Amino acid sequence: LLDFDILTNDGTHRNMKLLIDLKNIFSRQLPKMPKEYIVKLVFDRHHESMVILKNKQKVIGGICFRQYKPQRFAEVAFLAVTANEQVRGYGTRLMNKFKDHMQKQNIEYLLTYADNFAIGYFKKQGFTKEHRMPQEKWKGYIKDYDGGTLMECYIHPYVDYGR
Amino acid sequence: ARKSTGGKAPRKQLA
Ligand SMILES: CC(C)(COP(=O)(O)OP(=O)(O)OC[C@H]1O[C@@H](n2cnc3c(N)ncnc32)[C@H](O)[C@@H]1OP(=O)(O)O)[C@@H](O)C(=O)NCCC(=O)NCCS
To answer: Under an 8 A CB cutoff, do A112 and B8 touch?
Structure first.
């Protein structure tokens, strides 16, 4: 039964199976993403994945992010829940768990590029189009794409996110 | 970057 764990790319058979499963969920739910691209970010050293584990073995969703610790902000790379598990509240519970985790990690802002429907989805999750975080903080660290809408979520130090 | 930012793609989740 349901667990939200931080999946570490430590070269072990167990975690590496879970990362591959999460990666396959990502490419399935994000057809516009080059699959080799999802692989590169998910298994790079800089990235982490918080997954939704059904029991102690099956991946049904997760979020791949990258923390920029000194600057105290993190970028969401990919977010998804497997087809047969969508519309059950998991995606929202994941985001809440993520924010709570980032709060404990001393992260002040969450950033994510969004497109089309995703903008509305992240708005429901607390992200906004206007930023209260200074440009120069992410500039040079996070790529500046003109084709995408950059959204941010302020993580207040003592607001109860997650539950 | 050899491949690297940490990024998405959802373009209209209604497909
Ligand atoms: C976005 C996503 C993670 C949400 O996860 P989830 O487990 O389905 O989330 P929830 O059940 O908490 O979502 C609740 C709401 O989202 C809507 N929703 C969830 N999946 C949906 C789908 N496939 N199509 C349309 N609406 C959907 C529900 O209708 C619901 O109603 P509400 O907005 O009035 O509350 C999931 O839809 C997904 O994996 N999408 C494809 C990947 C993607 O586009 N990810 C974000 C960008 S990388």
So the answer is: yes
Resolution (A): 2.3
Q: Tell me how far apart the alpha carbons of residues A9 and A44 are, in angstroms, rounded to a whole number.
A: 8
Domain ranges of chain A: 1-163
Residues ≥6 apart with Cβ < 8 Å to A109: A72, A73, A74, A133, A152, A153, A154, A155
Experimental method: X-ray
Its CATH class, for the domain covering A1-163, is: alpha beta
Candidates B5, B11, B14, partner chain A, best to mutate (most A CBs within 10 A):
B5
Q: Determine the Cα–Cα distance for residues A111 and A150; give it in Å rounded to an integer.
A: 7
User: What does the alpha-carbon distance between residue A50 and residue A52 come to, in Å, rounded to a whole number?
Assistant: 7
Q: Which of A44, A157, A162 is nearest to A109 (CA)?
A: A157
Residues 6+ apart with CB under 8 A from A51: A4, A5, A7, A18, A22, A59, A61, A62
Pure H helices in A30-116? 35-42, 90-104
